[PDB]
Amino acid sequence: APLPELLSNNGKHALMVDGAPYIILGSQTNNSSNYPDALKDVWPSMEKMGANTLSIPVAWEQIEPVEGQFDFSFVDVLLKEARQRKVRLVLLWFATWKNNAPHYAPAWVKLDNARFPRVVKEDGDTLNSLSPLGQNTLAADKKAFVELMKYLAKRDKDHTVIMVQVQNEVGTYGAVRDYSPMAQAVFNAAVPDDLIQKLQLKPGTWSQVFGRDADEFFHAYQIARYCDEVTVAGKAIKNLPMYVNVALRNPFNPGLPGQYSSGGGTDNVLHIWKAAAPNIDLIAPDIYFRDYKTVSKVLELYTRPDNALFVAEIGNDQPFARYLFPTLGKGGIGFSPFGMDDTDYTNYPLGAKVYNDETIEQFAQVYRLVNPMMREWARLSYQGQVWGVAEPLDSTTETQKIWNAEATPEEKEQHKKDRASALTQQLDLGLWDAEVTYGRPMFWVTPPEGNTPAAGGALIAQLDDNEYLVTAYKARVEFKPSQELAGKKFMIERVEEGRFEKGKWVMERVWNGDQTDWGLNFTDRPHLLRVKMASYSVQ
Amino acid sequence: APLPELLSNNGKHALMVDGAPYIILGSQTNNSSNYPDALKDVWPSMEKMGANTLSIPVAWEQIEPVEGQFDFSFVDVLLKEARQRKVRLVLLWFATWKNNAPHYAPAWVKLDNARFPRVVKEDGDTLNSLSPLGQNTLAADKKAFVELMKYLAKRDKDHTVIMVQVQNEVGTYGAVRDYSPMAQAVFNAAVPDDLIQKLQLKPGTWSQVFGRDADEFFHAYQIARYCDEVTVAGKAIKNLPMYVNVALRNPFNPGLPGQYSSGGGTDNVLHIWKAAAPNIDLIAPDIYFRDYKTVSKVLELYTRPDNALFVAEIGNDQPFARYLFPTLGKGGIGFSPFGMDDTDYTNYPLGAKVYNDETIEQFAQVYRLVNPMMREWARLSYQGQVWGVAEPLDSTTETQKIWNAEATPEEKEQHKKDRASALTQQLDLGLWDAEVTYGRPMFWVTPPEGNTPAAGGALIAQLDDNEYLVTAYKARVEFKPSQELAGKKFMIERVEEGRFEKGKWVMERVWNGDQTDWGLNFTDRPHLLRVKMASYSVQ
Ligand code: NA
Ligand code: NA
Ligand code: NA
């Protein structure tokens, strides 16, 4: 079977798996589930979720517990159990950095600062974050990563593993960069030529060329180079797609580097990362912001002509499930909720307060919309036109409930109108537009009041000028002409509910009458529709 | 197999069973379950609880219903059923005293006051409490107890019965001592030499040597001698460990002897009991105080270089389960909740209002932490260093809930701070300290607010200078250096979850990342951890 690969063309992207575009409908384990005995607490969640791909760590400490006495016994069991369940894997290389720190590096690495040095603050104190200028550290990480890739080259010829994350949330908290003498010598030197050329900049030292951003851009550059080298060495063994995942700064109100993880692929240093690390396939956001506006901004910033969108981690609380829709609508190649296992941990406040079947079911319900068309959707996303939206108001707060109640009757009616309007989205589909609304009956035209909790969304793919594939969730989708018709009228020509079997459309039933008089109304159950529209003459 | 025995060395203790230290994770029946037909209502509770030892009465009235005519049919059945279930037994000899009174003595004893005399009050009235100076009573009790011990010598060679309680809550309510002419004659006489020598006192009569404490100390001494003689006679037949259990006085606010049970092993007469009864292995508190401060004080007073801690009875309501932790932390040899059977009785207000699976489960959940390491814990407790803590605030009262709500915003914030601080415990583990906190998320650092109801605790054993065995319940445990290091930093080197198999540690998984970033967080599920800490140079 051909290698998985990330294709980029015409500002669009596809993750090719087994020779065709693929969507990762993912689940990711908690951080301590990377052992054979823990897998029994991972698989059942995956099954309940309907996930097709598991993201799970492989730690440097476990594969090289003594230097270089390699142990791949976890990987062996993981591959075999994944294959039995017919799912794919994304392995997460937890090594020099995991959330800025070396906790998953072997004891012989993390306890030997002389050989493998830490970031030194400007005031001389040391942080528990390994410096990207540590040459021994790079060589050692690289060597172990190579051994892992050799294991996959020899033992995973059908590519059960489809992608590898290199490190996990790199960077440093508590300082902007390494200020050690070793780092200071490089910082005081000339900015490397290659970076100067790629950005279109005048030569100089770091402070001269970057000014107020020199410290942060320096750290980003050095980390990016470190990760790029590890990536190249591993890809020389087996050329799987590889990516890095970002501990995000708030895109609207980031604060200072060091408060956020400095040097990772934050939105202000994507240009540094892309210039410095041409061998890393994509830079993936880890999304734990709950609110629609911030999440939407993150999806906008990380979807670029030079960057495929992969939501490598997202919170597992209920409000996060609907972000699958805009993720896919942007041409995203995947989506992977974090902490989908029963190993007795909840990362609340970041995710769900409790982990049970209801937690899983919020994601299972949205994955059920995509699974039955996964390959067809992936192709259309890469080659054609897709759209995707989520319910754009967050669930009403207790503070907002109080303020709501204390309001004048005129103000309450105005608020309802404001909410209805905010809960109405327009999509321009060429000759036709769609209007998506949330939280209303399936009959008549009473205005939308939203779902409680906020949960809805819709996916649309264009099949032809007048024909669309549509599936949605707790929402109404209504079609209309995109431009004035000139003495023509319009209608729905035909709505079919069905499925793809061996790549061919099979009709189950025609929606008509009540089911198409008031838009196309979706609840929590999965329905995949082919909608054909027509303008017609009445002259 | 070798006889069970209580060892005492270097101010520490162990209950040896089958040649190694043992922890009684007990259950005790209600008072009327000591019959073959009642056992079907006892065993299922034991199984649901995960108890390893059953405490159950054997009554003088049932073994010698007619003088001279012994009946061990109950004991026969009990032994056989216990063996089938692979549990051990502690038999409770209910004889001359059961809660101060002779109700479990045969009719031919308790109805013959001439032969077997009662305590006489100073005013000449009689109380239903047998005088410890009644020589016929002592001889008769002793004779029956000897027959019981003969039955065990001949019919329990593998020591299904590991310990015997001699009497049950001895003493007298309603008077301080016996004031009968017979007792008055002894009280007026010289204090016995042996007691004078052992306490380091000047000879004299009771009033002269003890003053204001003479009446109470006299009753304690006489009862202690009576119980010691019974104990010696039984041990001459089979030398099992034997103990007495105490109807406690409130250690902070006891009131007067006679209001509490005068003459039992209350905290003010332990010195009398130890001097008078050298053959009784230990003196065990019966704990029905609900509140942390009082329970903690009782555990402190009963844990002594000359007294192994055994919580021979404790209430079976929810708040009591967490006291297993400090019991074991003090080097306790056992813990036995009272009334764990379904014989249609609740001793509420002393225990739980209702008896059902939930009542049992509160104890099952904490026994599940200890059972998998029972032998390893018992050894470490005897030979090494252990610690144990329980959540130190009791559940918030309705009165405190009202007061909390009516409070000013500044006062509410101060109260939360005060509670957080009270819900934070420090333990000095040598080179490392642990901080235990209760009722907080498993991620980030928001301050502890306590569990509702109060329920948490933690056990720690030292394996080496930098390595500890840890298990806890509804709590967070965080490690730090015990002393400022000098230009060194520190981290967790490794946390392994696992179990002991044939006395050897088997690793199941490594806790890392999220699972160790914010201390070690436990819910209601059992996890046994080996925690290795490291200081490291950054010079
Ligand atoms: Na248009
Ligand atoms: Na210390
Ligand atoms: Na200290």
Residue numbers in the entry:
A (entry chain A), B (entry chain C): 37 to 575
The authors write:
Given its poor sequence similarity to other GH35 enzymes (vide supra), this two-domain fold exhibits low homology to other currently known protein structures; only one significant structural match to another bacterial GH35 β-galactosidase, from Caulobacter crescentus strain CB15, was found. Structure/sequence homology searching of the C-terminal region in isolation produced no significant results that would indicate similarity to known regulatory or carbohydrate-binding modules (CBMs), despite the observation of a trough-like surface somewhat reminiscent of a substrate recognition cleft. In addition, the observation that the early part of the C-terminal domain is formed from a distortion of the final helix of the barrel domain, and that the initial β-strand of this domain stacks directly against the penultimate barrel helix, strongly suggests a rigid, monolithic structure.
Genome walking in silico revealed the presence of open reading frames encoding a predicted β-galactosidase from glycoside hydrolase (GH) family 35 (CjBgl35A, encoded by locus tag CJA_2707, bgl35A), a predicted TonB-dependent receptor (TBDR, encoded by CJA_2709), and a predicted α-l-fucosidase from glycoside hydrolase family 95 (CjAfc95A, encoded by CJA_2710, afc95A) upstream from the gene encoding the known α-xylosidase CjXyl31A (CJA_2706, xyl31A). The liberated XyGOs are then imported into the periplasm via the TBDR, where the exo-glycosidases CjXyl31A, CjBgl35A, and CjAfc95A work in concert, together with a currently unidentified β-glucosidase(s), to yield monosaccharides for further catabolism.
